[PDB]
Design a protein around this ligand. Sequence first.
Ligand SMILES: [Zn+2]
Length: 92
Amino acid sequence: NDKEYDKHKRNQQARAFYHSREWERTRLAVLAKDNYLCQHCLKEKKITRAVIVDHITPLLVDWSKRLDMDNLQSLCQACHNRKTAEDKRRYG
Ligand SMILES: [Zn+2]
């Protein structure tokens, strides 16, 4: 297919994913496993409530890992922001 169309379809698929029953359930499973604590803060010896579950390898980078618990971490906002910058260095 046309490259820009493939990009469109990937982005539409990713948008739909966050509405999915599978994501809703898996998000909850990760937060529960993590005891609602930010996993980056915990590794840095800090206690912070998580507010988001993030893909380690981003969803748009590897669709196949979208529901893998070892590809998901509960994060606070500050750690999500830090990770976003880190990921720009890796993937643009
Ligand atoms: Zn944190």
